[PDB]
Amino acid sequence: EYIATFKGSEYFCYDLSQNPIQSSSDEITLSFKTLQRNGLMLHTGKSADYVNLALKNGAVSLVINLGSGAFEALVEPVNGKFNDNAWHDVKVTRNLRQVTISVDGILTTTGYTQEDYTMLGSDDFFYVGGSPSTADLPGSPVSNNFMGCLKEVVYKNNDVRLELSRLAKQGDPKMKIHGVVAFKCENVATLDPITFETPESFISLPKWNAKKTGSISFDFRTTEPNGLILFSHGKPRHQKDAKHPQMIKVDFFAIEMLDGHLYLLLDMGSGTIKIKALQKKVNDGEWYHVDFQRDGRSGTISVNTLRTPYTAPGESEILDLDDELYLGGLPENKAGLVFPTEVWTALLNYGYVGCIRDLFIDGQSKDIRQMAEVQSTAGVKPSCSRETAKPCLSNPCKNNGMCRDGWNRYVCDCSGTGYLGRSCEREATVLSYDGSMFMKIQLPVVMHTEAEDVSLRFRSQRAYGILMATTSRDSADTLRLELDAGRVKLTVNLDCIRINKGPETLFAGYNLNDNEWHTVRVVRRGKSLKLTVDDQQAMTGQMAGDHTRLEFHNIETGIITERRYLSSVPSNFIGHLQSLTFNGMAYIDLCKNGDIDYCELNARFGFRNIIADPVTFKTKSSYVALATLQAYTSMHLFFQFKTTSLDGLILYNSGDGNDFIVVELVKGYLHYVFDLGNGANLIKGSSNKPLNDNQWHNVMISRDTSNLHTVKIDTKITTQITAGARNLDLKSDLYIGGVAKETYKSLPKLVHAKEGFQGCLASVDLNGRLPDLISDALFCNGQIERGCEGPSTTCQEDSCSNQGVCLQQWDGFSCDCSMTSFSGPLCNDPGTTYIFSKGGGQITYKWPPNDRPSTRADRLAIGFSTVQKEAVLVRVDSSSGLGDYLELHIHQGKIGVKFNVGTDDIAIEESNAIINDGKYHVVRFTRSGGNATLQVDSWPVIERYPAGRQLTIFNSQATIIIGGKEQGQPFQGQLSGLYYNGLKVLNMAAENDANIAIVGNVRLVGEV
């Protein structure tokens, strides 16, 4: 008996080229044992002549071509199945073009080979149990090597009797046993199926060694609408993109789910191909069989049997994958890994979750419940179960998060809620923006995408302003969300090439400037845009020009800082944001918690009511004039004021004819007066009290395209509707906070004002533009002063407190403490003090070899107390081989300094002042080349001007040594607040600066 266990990845191989089979008669016998539904038992020959016998989804297939039109048979499972693990028999006989296939010896089928050929000629190879590629050999219906046991295999023809089961065992120099081996039976088989529990979970796979041809099959099961199943790329091509030379192009293929839809992706070196693998959505939570067969340019993709044609563009046949292939998602931060833009799910971090079994690569079963399964993958499990409890009953999403019933898990969509995290349990961080702050995520490498999900929540009082924006250093491409006249406006600009579009936009929402929070969600899939504010109905648009790919280097909020190529941009935001989410990154939170280091900003975290760049008008009569209001089609004004005065003109701008617009305070109440060609109207803003109670008020005044005017004061809307009128430009400059003295005597009809505004304006928004009231003024009158808090503090005789130097800044004075021996903002706190006690000590600063200073002017100050008569406090030496040094010492109870910059030594000594005394003294030394000066405490400055040839550079400074041990005169007392050319040497030492060594008896003091 000749029985042999076919391991799966093993097969027999006979060489017929020394004695060709070619025959008119012939006959084929064997018994088979298999659990599996497909597998090649055997095959011989190439082109037009072959004979091919194998199990095809549970039935015995047989193909014969004698040279001109095959005979195909597929004998059926009558009473039970063939994949039963029991023995079954095959007899195949053939007389000329006549074929009979017998099963177990009684399930016959008869037919003919086509046309007139009768000669089966094959001089290549005779395969048993599998092959180098099964989906290739001619007439194959399967693509699978055999798993299980084969018995008593024989091909008798009229001439020779190739008895293959026997010749393989007894050993023949014409029989090649390619891979594995195994020669008994009663040996069983099967391989486990697998569950990928989490998105991020993935299995790493052995290189698909494709080429011209390759095939793949596996089974899947899930209720997850989106996810990346299989993916693999080649090596980076020298053939660049025209538009994106920055974008790494590679050969590849992927299989992917996207909204329950199955998808195949191939790129072989010229253009991609996307294929709906099946019409119906496949996230049925039902098993599906997936064959993928490819042959150079063409191939088919098969779902439960239903095959779909493809041909990839261009003439590239080879699909050149190299190295690792991936199943169920991608790793994070594998360098070398390149995500091609065409593959949506890779770039949206939708790793697959669900079940996968029975994997075959080029015909060969790879078992997975081992793969990197027993090889330490996290979030993958042995068997595959479907938890009948619907997990969103678990009731798991907090705070009105939306719950999605997943695979074996629920998912939360926290986007609209102010929370994040698996269960919306984490409060989401708020960034707050006052019109001159930004928060900019600089991606660590450059993104290229064809598809996004972006959401964010904002609130603002302003009808305009940027929400979020992606930007490139290399072009003006951008995906951007912004407030535009109260609506949210999505803009998707993709830029040029071809020449010898416009922007594409959506709008959603109205009046979102109410200072309540709104959620905005953008989905892009290629040319499709979908935008949607809050719960309202989604607004959709198809983009038109056939570019889809978007390059970005940053995601920007607040200010658009990267705008090299735009001479103009949406205006800076003022309000708050929260829950920025961009292909699932929560950048605001990541940034705040420091989970990412590439986030850069000057927004402030946490919410606060904003007053944005407040400006003071000191006297009524002070006013500025700005360039003309630009209310084209609609108008949205906003500002805040704070005043103690009952009446003044606040905003005036006039037009052609009787046209004008005014905003004024009258007897405490706010009045918006205007005439747009139908005569003057007054609308009184609504409040019970006078508004000059020295608090900030918000004022918001707007005319829309229906001519509905609205005046809002703090929380109170007043609306009125006025006459339909060709809306016309204004003409005069735009005056704020008064007008020229002479003008009030002739302002329009119902304008009360005879005097300007006194008080503060802030957050001034003129129909989309945030002027800097002081800086953008065209001219000015009287005093407009920055801030809302009177003037900056200015320097006084007594301002700094230890001979600190008082310097003026724009926001009040500072004290330069450098030459005092002190610290703190008024030079009044003790400088960093070290106590040098008995037996000596030493703090050394050592410059790193290349930052060795070489100066023409030095200055050094330090504070000290000591009883000593002889001591070296501090010394600075040049590096090994040069003369130059500077040394502050106490010789004969008197403080002094000695230095050499390449000529003579120069001494300078405070001769008269007691300093070894026990009391605190400070000494300040300066030097300019040859000349130097010395001063202690309050003693007149001592100046030294050498005559003759002085060199001037203290060359290559290498160490500052404090303490005296080197120069053998240890210091003993207290050294405090030493400053040398910019270095605060003791602050440095008290902070473990790596270039500081401390040795010996020397202690850092406490503070108060």
Ligand SMILES: *[C@@H]1O[C@H](CO)[C@@H](O[C@@H]2O[C@H](CO)[C@@H](O)[C@H](O)[C@H]2NC(C)=O)[C@H](O)[C@H]1NC(C)=O
């Ligand atoms: C060292 O000190 C002297 C003395 O004041 C400086 O020499 C004078 O420089 C001034 C301009 O500041 C000239 O008008 C004089 O002609 C110079 N007088 C002398 C005595 O030469 C000198 O420049 C200082 N040198 C350095 C390098 O700081």
